Amino acid sequence: EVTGLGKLVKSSDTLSKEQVLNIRDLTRYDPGIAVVEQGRGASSGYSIRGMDKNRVSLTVDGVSQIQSYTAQAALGGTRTAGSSGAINEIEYENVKAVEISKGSNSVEQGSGALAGSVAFQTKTADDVIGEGRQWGIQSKTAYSGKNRGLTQSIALAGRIGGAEALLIHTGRRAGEIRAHEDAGRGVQSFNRLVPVEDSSNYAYFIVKEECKNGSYETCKANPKKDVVGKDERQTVSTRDYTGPNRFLADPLSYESRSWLFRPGFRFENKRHYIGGILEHTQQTFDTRDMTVPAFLTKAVFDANKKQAGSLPGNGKYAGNHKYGGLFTNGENGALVGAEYGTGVFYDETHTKSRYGLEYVYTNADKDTWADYARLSYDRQGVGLDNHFQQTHCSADGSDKYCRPSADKPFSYYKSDRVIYGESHRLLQAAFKKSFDKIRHNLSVNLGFDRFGSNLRHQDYYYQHANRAYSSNTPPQNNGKKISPNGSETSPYWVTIGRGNVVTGQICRLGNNTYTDCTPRSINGKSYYAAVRDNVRLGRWADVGAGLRYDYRSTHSDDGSVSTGTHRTLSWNAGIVLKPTDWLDLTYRTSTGFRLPSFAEMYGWRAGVQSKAVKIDPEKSFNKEAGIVFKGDFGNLEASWFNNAYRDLIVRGYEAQIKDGKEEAKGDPAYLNAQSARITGINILGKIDWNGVWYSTFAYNRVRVRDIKKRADRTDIQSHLFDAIQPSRYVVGLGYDQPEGKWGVNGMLTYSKAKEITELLGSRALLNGNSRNTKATARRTRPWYIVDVSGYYTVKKHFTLRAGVYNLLNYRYVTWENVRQTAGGAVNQHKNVGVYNRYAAPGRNYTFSLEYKF
Amino acid sequence: KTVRWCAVSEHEATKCQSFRDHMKSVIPSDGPSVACVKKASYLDCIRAIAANEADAVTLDAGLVYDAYLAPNNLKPVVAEFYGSKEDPQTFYYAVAVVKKDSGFQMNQLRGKKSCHTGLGRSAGWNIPIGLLYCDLPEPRKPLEKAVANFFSGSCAPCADGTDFPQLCQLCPGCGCSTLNQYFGYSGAFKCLKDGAGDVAFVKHSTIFENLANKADRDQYELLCLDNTRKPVDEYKDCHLAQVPSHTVVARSMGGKEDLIWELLNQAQEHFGKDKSKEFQLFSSPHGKDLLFKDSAHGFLKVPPRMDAKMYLGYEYVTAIRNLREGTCPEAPTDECKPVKWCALSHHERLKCDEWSVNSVGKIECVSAETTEDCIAKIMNGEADAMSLDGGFVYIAGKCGLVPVLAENYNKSDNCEDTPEAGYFAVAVVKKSASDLTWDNLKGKKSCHTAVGRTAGWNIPMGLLYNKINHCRFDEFFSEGCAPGSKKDSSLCKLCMGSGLNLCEPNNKEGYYGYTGAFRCLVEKGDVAFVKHQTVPQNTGGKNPDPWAKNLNEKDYELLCLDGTRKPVEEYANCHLARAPNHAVVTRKDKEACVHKILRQQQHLFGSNVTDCSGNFCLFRSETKDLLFRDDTVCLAKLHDRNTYEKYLGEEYVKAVGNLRKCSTSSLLEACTFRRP
Ligand SMILES: *[C@@H]1O[C@H](CO)[C@@H](O[C@@H]2O[C@H](CO)[C@@H](O[C@@H]3O[C@H](CO[C@H]4O[C@H](CO)[C@@H](O[C@@H]5O[C@H](CO)[C@@H](O[C@@H]6O[C@H](CO)[C@H](O)[C@H](O)[C@H]6O)[C@H](O)[C@H]5NC(C)=O)[C@H](O)[C@@H]4O)[C@@H](O)[C@H](O[C@H]4O[C@H](CO)[C@@H](O[C@@H]5O[C@H](CO)[C@@H](O[C@@H]6O[C@H](CO[C@]7(C(=O)O)C[C@H](O)[C@@H](NC(C)=O)[C@H]([C@H](O)[C@H](O)CO)O7)[C@H](O)[C@H](O)[C@H]6O)[C@H](O)[C@H]5NC(C)=O)[C@H](O)[C@@H]4O)[C@@H]3O)[C@H](O)[C@H]2NC(C)=O)[C@H](O)[C@H]1NC(C)=O
Ligand SMILES: *[C@@H]1O[C@H](CO)[C@@H](O[C@@H]2O[C@H](CO)[C@@H](O[C@@H]3O[C@H](CO[C@H]4O[C@H](CO)[C@@H](O[C@@H]5O[C@H](CO)[C@@H](O[C@@H]6O[C@H](CO[C@]7(C(=O)O)C[C@H](O)[C@@H](NC(C)=O)[C@H]([C@H](O)[C@H](O)CO)O7)[C@H](O)[C@H](O)[C@H]6O)[C@H](O)[C@H]5NC(C)=O)[C@H](O)[C@@H]4O)[C@@H](O)[C@H](O[C@H]4O[C@H](CO)[C@@H](O[C@@H]5O[C@H](CO)[C@@H](O)[C@H](O)[C@H]5NC(C)=O)[C@H](O)[C@@H]4O)[C@@H]3O)[C@H](O)[C@H]2NC(C)=O)[C@H](O)[C@H]1NC(C)=O
Ligand SMILES: CCCCCCCCOCCOCCOCCOCCO
Ligand SMILES: CCCCCCCCOCCOCCOCCOCCO
């Protein structure tokens, strides 16, 4: 049947069977569809048919989720927060089904379905309440060894009516996903500045506070000698090392809590249903960036001197506290001491809140004008809270809570929080009716959404505690004043007091850089109307078609935001010829479009006034032909696709040709600049092995073809296809007992290497000029792994699960990991450095205990 | 060596004699001779000097521009100064006078009513109309009809009242005499004072010559080109254009120039010149302003490095060029044209070329031999911007340029909003070398980076010029090393670098530069005038070379202006003066655009925010420090310190000046001739 081919459906049961707990487990055996790493342990949506992030739509119960938002980066040579960039991960313990669509799909999922779409539907009371029972309670509890991840879930559901209710609570705590034990084991060295007596014969001083009787004249008889820094070699474990040449991923501390409540009422007649929905899930991704050297070295002290010169008080110290003494320039005018190590932290907080009401009209028998209808209202909010923190007030460490204080001279702290959020107030009408011998299945869908996008920038300040110090001319005694030179007989006259703590607010208003903490607020309304129809043309063929209109209007107080009206037209059509040798000849066509994102609308800024520019939507077109052999053996499916993207949005310049020569006009802006097409192949099948158990097969191979840039644009980096998941084979062999008590499964996955052509390119200039550029510094090698899983149930009640993943301890590095280093990656890693840290996990175990009651 | 003049009218042909009559005074052999040559028009004179049958003609600014033009390239050499010597009216100022608080700026002249001194006149017509030429409504030919439809009624005397009625709306008929109440400088001003017009185009002096009272003139203002107003007594900082009154001009490269001055100066002397008897050169028995203007008080020599366009000025040249060539963009998009950067070497030009390519046209490139040649190219408009050290910001500022952006080296979140103060120029001595102070510095051996450089020369000799009023620093110190000085001077008596590189401002001279100057201190000299980072830069091992490997910064102290000494880290209370970091400078009419684009460029190719291995980086260079310093964090905008005096600081300004007027820079000399 036409609706839907090119789909990939997974149920709640399929999920529990494959023991998927992480977002990465979900498409683990589906080649051609991958999860894009966010950089700090989160994720930023999916990657299909060459495109990723905001080019594949992510929906839950008809409501789109958060857009990936990346704020323009800060100048100044310091570490900052930036926006999260992530897209919110769904709690799988709340979903009944998942519908993944490859290729364009805007008629179904609207804006954002350029290259594909991922749609989730939430569970109901019936998914927990058994066949002949009035209530029910389920209980999944799982441990995943690869990230020391415990997950616990309980689901309550009961019905006395009439009235029904569903209540689900899920708690998850995990850590960093560990790597192969050999990749990143061992030891490494680094330097650390330590105090040493200055050898100069002019390095003498006394301090006023240490002159308890008399004065300089009497106290100079006991001078102290200055101190200087020499660094010393130190060796630590790879886990403890801080610096550029890092062997292990940043330590992650992950937590998730999710609440789902869904009350409902069945009326009389049994064809009327009102129901509410209440979801609140929150995740935290807290890391420490170990790429940052904790300890100061002589190399950086000398560097600062070259620029800033020596510092008053250097080498001099209160009491015997030699260490010291040793302090140098930080950032934001701070002086930082060698006795503390610095630490950098990111505390990300992802919160989704959903409140919705629905009315559902079913009708079988089918005597009224609609066999199915649904009115729904949904208020959703998603917030990504990214809190940067830098401390230099501990011996490492590293402390995230320590602060500069008078008793801690030469300490430092910086805070920076960027909060991104979206809201929908979506009103959806869905009607459905079947007409007739040739049966027509008509479908209409209405939509109204009042939406808003908001980025806040706050808690952005520094603090330091610079020491109270002065070097003074001693009192005259007697005759005339003598300014000392630091000799043993003429030591300096110095006073040293405790540090004075200073705060600086970093935020500015209306200056159009990263430090502009004027909230970026974009609001709007939107409408969609969609008519679809699929007909069964006898037994020989089925034909489907769909049409959709989308309107979107946006406003911002900020006149520089690319704001306006869009009206796009989406349509699809498919055919399934069945000459029935139990083989189907399939051919489908669908359009896809993506409106300018909220980050693209805000535009590129360089601390000067910007005009707003018009942005047309990205568009795509997907032709796909396929053949499937079905029968007693099961089925074997193959398809060839051709997706053509157009009006791709990139940062560049408008171009025009005045007197023969082309030239750039306007500002650097986000414009529709490029088109690109991709072709490929998919094989999918399952064998029955009869034969007189089962097997699975899957294969994907994407290729890039034409890449044409618009003649009215320049400074256009072509297109690095680093998003494309490398060609992969995944075969399966497993046995399910017909009784349904136990089962075994074996999975073999083999991925090709990353094609170097997919990450190479050039930047177009004028007139025939260009510059060759690469996406990453490295590409990945081929690899194969085997997973073995099994289960056992004790009749409806207890059911145990166990999986050994990467049985052969194969040491390899995944491409999806290396992608994080690419230019253009959300929260790109730099500068690597050593690629050991991107190693995939070796042999790992997961265990799940499911209870029904 | 004979010097032939040239006269237009047959009346001044007789005025040109003597000749050998009342000028035959103290004639050697072949030198101070003056002949007469007759030609019809003023053009014929310059066309004659183009050959050789003429050598010297005095011209008004309009013809000075004509004489500069090809093929007969003529250069100005001598000017008629008026008034005092302390206040020589060599140039006048074209000015726009308005009533106080009248509510409009220079870019809002459209639809207003104008008062001119007369059609075709310099300050009253050519300059303002020339400067407005592009804003005029097409067709811009004929010019009168265009101006008439740009203003809402004007008094343009000496113009045709019938063909161009609107140009006589404020004065019916356009009287070309005193009969017209609104004629000339005073007449145009009256047209404003009465309220007939909203703006009067006259000379700076006009309002002071028609309004004797301060309170009366307090009711008037001036329009500045930057779209602000200023009081009428600030014309020097608020004028349409500066213009040379009467300028004598020779045939550039290929014609007696120093002989012409030797004449005209000697011709002053013997007031046979004109402030004794016979014959007063300036006044004529049969005519007015015959050979020279009667208002003249004598002559001054135009500085060597002064070409015509630099002499007439950017504003004037721009206005007249518009008036003649008439070339204006038919598509006035009112957006920013490419910024033309100026490169000082092949390596700078290479990097600039790469930048221009990566900047998709927003940056273009021009080269020049020296720093001063580039500044002059920015002045005349052949270039737009370049980065300059504090020293060259002072001279560029005396030449009418402004700083747009400062180079910043501090790592901070708000780098691009906060301009850094800069560094400190200090005097370094050894602690062992007792007894040294700033007072008894006379007779000691000094170490300078190079003569003419900011911290190494200008500032220290600037503080010392207020001790001994003479540019003989050679005879103040015992000896020393100041690379660039005369070979027979005492400031080369202990340099190094064999050959002819001895005492030469380049790295072949081992004592050139900050580093070399400090090396001079530790090996030969006893006091170095250097940067406050210099000593730590070359101690502790940062300088791996043998002469500096074991050196310790704490072996050295600093000379303070109060006669005391402090260690090298106490520079903040022991310096000569504060100097600013490098700054990008440009013309005033480019300030906004340069500001806009350079800030855009650093967000495209800035320090971080890009992979410097894979792409272009603005702040990285194939050798060292090309275009900008290599440790530039970002370019910071300038609010308060947007002028050269405010950017440099009062300490720097008070320090030099003196040493100025005593300087060697020929560019500074040239710009000082125009201001003042
Ligand atoms: C880049 O990089 C570079 C390099 O590094 C850098 O630079 C640097 O910097 C630094 C600083 O930071 C420095 O150092 C410094 O020095 C000084 C001195 O020296 C100097 O000299 C001169 C004079 O002498 C000067 O000049 C100046 O200038 C400046 C600038 O511009 C200015 O400022 C400004 O101004 C303006 C105009 O007017 C305005 O005013 C504003 O406001 C400002 O900003 C000024 O003014 C001037 N002067 C004066 C003074 O005035 C030059 O510049 C030089 O600098 C010294 O002094 C310092 O000191 C430091 O140290 C010490 C020890 O440690 C400490 O302590 C201090 O001390 C004092 C005395 O004793 C004190 O006072 C006191 O006070 C009290 C009161 O209390 C209190 C309370 O209680 O409240 C506390 C607090 O804290 C305070 N403060 C605050 C902030 O808050 C307060 C006060 O009031 C305030 O004012 C408020 O606001 O208070 C009593 O009452 C009395 O008064 C007394 O006793 C104080 O306190 C303290 N302070 C603190 C803060 O604490 C500290 O630490 C200090 O800091 C030093 O040493 C150097 O030199 C430099 N270098 C160079 C090359 O330049 C930069 O930064 C960068 N850049 C960027 C942009 O990034
Ligand atoms: C924003 O933008 C900013 C710019 O605006 C950015 O700042 C810039 O960033 C730069 C990089 O951070 C920064 O630093 C520069 O770094 C170079 C050094 O090069 C880097 O890489 C080196 C190689 O990796 C390395 O250096 C050495 O290398 C040696 C030799 O290998 C190392 O020894 C190794 O160490 C091991 C360790 O032992 C074992 C061990 O642990 O025991 C065995 C053990 O079993 C294993 N463990 C395992 C296997 O598990 C380990 C393991 O193998 C290793 O860990 C693997 O990594 O090791 C042994 O001890 C053994 O010795 C050996 O194997 C040594 O350890 C390395 N040191 C360090 C610190 O690790 C470093 O990683 C280094 O970072 C500096 O040299 C630069 O300085 C110089 O630059 C120029 C160089 O040519 C020079 O310029 C000259 O100047 C002179 C004078 O004027 C003139 O002549 C010219 O002008 C010019 N000359 C020329 C030729 O042109 C000059 O010398 C200068 O000093 C440079 O400083 C850079 O400073 C800044 N830029 C600026 C302007 O500030 C920044 O990134 C951004 N900021 C932010 C916040 O994002
Ligand atoms: C007027 C806005 C109403 C829309 C809110 C609907 C959801 C209510 O919960 C919001 C709080 O939940 C946290 C999500 O963060 C806020 C998202 O909305 C802000 C973006 O404009
Ligand atoms: C424009 C040309 C720039 C070249 C960019 C790519 C450089 C080549 O990459 C090297 C590929 O080798 C990959 C190494 O990665 C895995 C091998 O080691 C894995 C450890 O298990």
XYZ file of N, CA and C in Angstrom, chain A residues 73-78 80 198 200 202 226 298 302 304-312 314 316 331-332 414 460 469 471 483 485 492 506 508 511 513 515 604-608 651 653 664 666-668 714 765-766 771 773 828, chain B residues 335 337 354 357-358 360-362 409-418 431-432 532-533 536-537 540 542 552-555 557 564-571 595-596 599-604 608-609 611 614-615 631 633-634:
330
model
N 29.504 32.988 17.240
C 30.556 32.831 18.241
C 31.169 34.148 18.699
N 31.758 34.117 19.890
C 32.314 35.309 20.516
C 33.775 35.557 20.149
N 34.108 36.819 19.905
C 35.496 37.224 19.737
C 36.069 37.512 21.112
N 37.394 37.504 21.220
C 38.049 37.882 22.459
C 39.053 36.860 22.951
N 39.019 35.671 22.358
C 39.961 34.625 22.710
C 39.701 34.001 24.068
N 38.441 34.000 24.487
C 38.069 33.382 25.753
C 37.033 32.289 25.540
N 33.443 30.699 26.208
C 32.106 31.194 26.516
C 31.076 30.069 26.469
N 64.948 33.365 43.276
C 65.599 34.165 42.246
C 67.085 34.282 42.567
N 69.272 36.505 41.226
C 69.752 37.881 41.133
C 70.122 38.455 42.497
N 69.771 41.356 43.342
C 68.914 42.509 43.571
C 67.481 42.064 43.804
N 63.363 37.201 46.558
C 62.284 37.026 45.590
C 62.155 35.573 45.151
N 55.269 28.066 32.531
C 56.180 29.166 32.239
C 55.989 29.718 30.829
N 55.635 33.778 30.316
C 56.508 34.529 29.416
C 55.705 35.216 28.322
N 52.580 36.291 28.457
C 51.929 37.459 29.028
C 52.899 38.617 29.229
N 54.117 38.305 29.661
C 55.121 39.340 29.874
C 55.431 40.050 28.571
N 55.580 39.283 27.493
C 55.847 39.860 26.178
C 54.808 40.914 25.812
N 53.552 40.651 26.152
C 52.478 41.583 25.835
C 52.244 42.640 26.911
N 52.198 42.216 28.170
C 51.818 43.111 29.263
C 52.990 43.590 30.112
N 54.146 42.951 29.960
C 55.293 43.254 30.799
C 55.194 42.548 32.138
N 56.199 42.741 32.984
C 56.176 42.218 34.343
C 55.051 42.842 35.177
N 54.702 42.187 36.279
C 53.624 42.659 37.141
C 54.149 43.084 38.505
N 53.642 44.210 39.022
C 53.967 44.657 40.379
C 53.716 43.544 41.386
N 55.371 40.671 41.648
C 55.814 39.344 41.225
C 57.109 38.936 41.917
N 57.314 38.411 44.995
C 57.176 38.799 46.392
C 55.937 38.176 47.024
N 42.183 36.723 31.996
C 41.336 37.467 31.082
C 40.536 38.485 31.889
N 39.941 39.457 31.204
C 39.099 40.459 31.851
C 39.786 41.199 32.999
N 34.210 32.978 36.128
C 33.351 33.544 35.105
C 32.082 32.725 34.969
N 25.996 36.540 33.213
C 27.216 36.652 32.423
C 28.158 37.661 33.077
N 48.700 45.474 47.148
C 50.152 45.555 47.095
C 50.657 46.932 46.693
N 54.815 48.921 46.395
C 56.238 48.995 46.670
C 56.536 50.466 46.904
N 65.742 55.772 47.073
C 64.901 54.750 46.460
C 65.688 53.455 46.263
N 67.118 49.511 45.628
C 67.332 48.789 44.378
C 67.157 47.273 44.484
N 63.758 46.232 48.912
C 62.525 46.968 48.660
C 61.626 47.034 49.890
N 29.472 41.437 32.103
C 29.956 41.306 30.736
C 28.893 41.691 29.704
N 26.216 43.417 27.398
C 25.970 44.735 26.824
C 24.567 44.739 26.219
N 24.524 45.996 21.079
C 25.823 46.174 20.439
C 26.092 45.152 19.341
N 26.827 41.920 19.174
C 27.810 40.848 19.223
C 27.307 39.781 20.176
N 28.002 39.408 23.144
C 27.731 40.019 24.439
C 26.436 40.825 24.467
N 23.592 37.043 10.706
C 25.005 37.109 11.039
C 25.305 38.552 11.425
N 26.013 38.748 12.536
C 26.282 40.101 13.024
C 27.733 40.325 13.431
N 28.231 41.532 13.172
C 29.627 41.861 13.442
C 29.793 43.161 14.227
N 28.859 43.427 15.134
C 28.965 44.581 16.008
C 28.605 45.892 15.341
N 27.928 45.803 14.206
C 27.465 46.988 13.509
C 26.009 46.812 13.111
N 25.659 31.230 4.914
C 26.185 32.571 5.124
C 27.072 32.973 3.949
N 27.243 36.278 0.464
C 26.924 37.613 -0.023
C 26.004 37.541 -1.231
N 30.294 41.661 -4.874
C 29.429 41.458 -3.723
C 28.671 42.733 -3.400
N 25.763 44.332 -0.425
C 25.138 44.104 0.865
C 26.100 43.595 1.921
N 25.544 43.073 3.009
C 26.333 42.600 4.140
C 26.507 41.089 4.072
N 27.452 40.546 4.854
C 27.471 39.094 5.023
C 26.154 38.652 5.651
N 27.692 34.939 -3.674
C 29.131 34.674 -3.554
C 29.589 34.456 -2.114
N 34.406 32.393 -4.855
C 34.664 33.817 -4.735
C 34.393 34.461 -6.087
N 34.943 35.648 -6.311
C 34.852 36.289 -7.620
C 36.239 36.376 -8.255
N 38.792 28.924 -3.041
C 39.743 28.374 -2.087
C 39.266 26.994 -1.642
N 38.684 23.829 0.601
C 38.521 23.637 2.036
C 38.068 22.220 2.378
N 31.425 22.562 17.785
C 32.621 21.927 17.242
C 33.773 21.820 18.236
N 25.520 52.818 -0.296
C 26.146 51.789 0.525
C 27.661 51.937 0.415
N 31.478 51.517 -0.608
C 32.410 51.082 -1.645
C 33.617 50.421 -0.982
N 45.701 38.481 -0.926
C 44.982 37.299 -0.461
C 43.719 37.709 0.284
N 41.044 38.904 -2.022
C 40.411 37.772 -2.682
C 39.377 37.108 -1.778
N 39.783 36.792 -0.551
C 38.892 36.175 0.429
C 37.761 37.083 0.907
N 35.954 38.882 -0.942
C 35.011 38.984 -2.058
C 34.817 40.433 -2.560
N 35.893 41.212 -2.496
C 35.908 42.547 -3.068
C 35.825 43.696 -2.079
N 35.465 43.390 -0.839
C 35.242 44.428 0.154
C 36.540 45.130 0.547
N 45.108 43.714 22.311
C 45.903 42.519 22.560
C 45.451 41.749 23.800
N 44.559 42.353 24.576
C 44.030 41.715 25.776
C 42.945 40.693 25.468
N 43.059 39.523 26.082
C 42.011 38.519 26.007
C 40.885 38.900 26.956
N 39.736 39.263 26.394
C 38.565 39.605 27.196
C 37.291 39.460 26.373
N 36.184 39.157 27.044
C 34.903 38.964 26.368
C 34.433 40.210 25.624
N 34.769 41.387 26.140
C 34.327 42.628 25.510
C 35.436 43.388 24.797
N 36.308 42.648 24.127
C 37.480 43.236 23.495
C 37.130 44.296 22.467
N 36.129 44.020 21.639
C 35.822 44.891 20.507
C 35.040 46.140 20.899
N 34.734 46.273 22.184
C 34.012 47.439 22.677
C 34.900 48.324 23.544
N 36.051 47.794 23.950
C 36.915 48.485 24.906
C 38.354 48.664 24.401
N 71.118 48.401 37.599
C 71.118 48.729 39.021
C 72.541 48.956 39.527
N 73.497 48.299 38.880
C 74.899 48.412 39.255
C 75.495 49.768 38.874
N 58.286 49.262 27.892
C 58.168 48.685 29.236
C 58.050 47.154 29.247
N 57.924 46.544 28.072
C 57.930 45.088 27.971
C 59.309 44.592 27.570
N 61.631 42.547 30.277
C 61.189 41.161 30.480
C 61.187 40.329 29.192
N 61.005 40.968 28.038
C 61.016 40.257 26.758
C 62.349 39.576 26.474
N 65.362 36.031 31.336
C 64.791 34.776 31.795
C 64.952 33.616 30.830
N 63.686 34.032 27.454
C 62.768 34.300 26.350
C 63.544 34.662 25.089
N 68.783 38.607 33.825
C 67.674 38.622 34.768
C 67.043 40.010 34.784
N 65.719 40.067 34.684
C 65.014 41.349 34.646
C 65.230 42.191 35.908
N 65.411 41.525 37.045
C 65.535 42.213 38.327
C 66.913 42.836 38.525
N 67.742 42.774 37.493
C 69.040 43.428 37.531
C 68.914 44.864 37.045
N 66.614 48.683 36.703
C 65.601 49.595 37.213
C 65.253 50.663 36.182
N 64.064 59.807 40.644
C 64.206 58.589 41.436
C 64.261 57.350 40.552
N 64.421 56.186 41.175
C 64.468 54.927 40.432
C 63.528 53.854 40.985
N 62.916 53.104 40.075
C 62.004 52.022 40.434
C 62.263 50.811 39.536
N 61.902 49.603 40.002
C 62.166 48.396 39.204
C 61.309 48.323 37.941
N 61.674 47.428 37.027
C 61.061 47.371 35.699
C 59.565 47.053 35.686
N 59.058 46.467 36.766
C 57.638 46.132 36.836
C 56.819 47.285 37.402
N 57.507 48.326 37.857
C 56.839 49.498 38.412
C 56.777 50.641 37.394
N 56.590 50.277 36.129
C 56.541 51.229 35.024
C 55.385 52.219 35.149
N 34.916 51.755 9.506
C 34.425 51.228 10.773
C 33.562 49.996 10.517
N 32.584 50.123 9.628
C 31.669 49.022 9.341
C 32.367 47.778 8.795
N 35.185 45.779 10.930
C 34.575 45.005 12.006
C 33.927 43.751 11.425
N 33.415 43.859 10.202
C 32.857 42.703 9.514
C 33.959 41.715 9.148
N 35.128 42.241 8.795
C 36.231 41.400 8.344
C 36.813 40.549 9.468
N 36.803 41.081 10.685
C 37.387 40.362 11.811
C 36.450 39.294 12.364
N 35.199 39.303 11.920
C 34.251 38.273 12.326
C 34.210 37.178 11.263
N 34.818 37.469 10.118
C 34.936 36.513 9.029
C 36.273 35.788 9.104
N 40.312 33.719 16.354
C 39.660 32.420 16.386
C 38.516 32.419 15.377
N 37.387 31.817 15.740
C 36.219 31.679 14.851
C 36.510 31.183 13.420
N 39.483 28.183 11.228
C 40.662 27.326 11.235
C 41.759 27.975 10.410
N 43.298 25.997 7.507
C 42.528 25.730 6.306
C 42.121 26.963 5.523
N 41.943 28.080 6.219
C 41.449 29.291 5.576
C 42.355 30.501 5.771
N 49.597 39.330 17.081
C 48.933 38.997 18.338
C 47.736 39.909 18.597
N 44.134 40.601 19.006
C 42.953 39.840 19.397
C 41.753 40.285 18.566
N 41.566 41.596 18.467
C 40.476 42.166 17.682
C 40.686 43.665 17.452
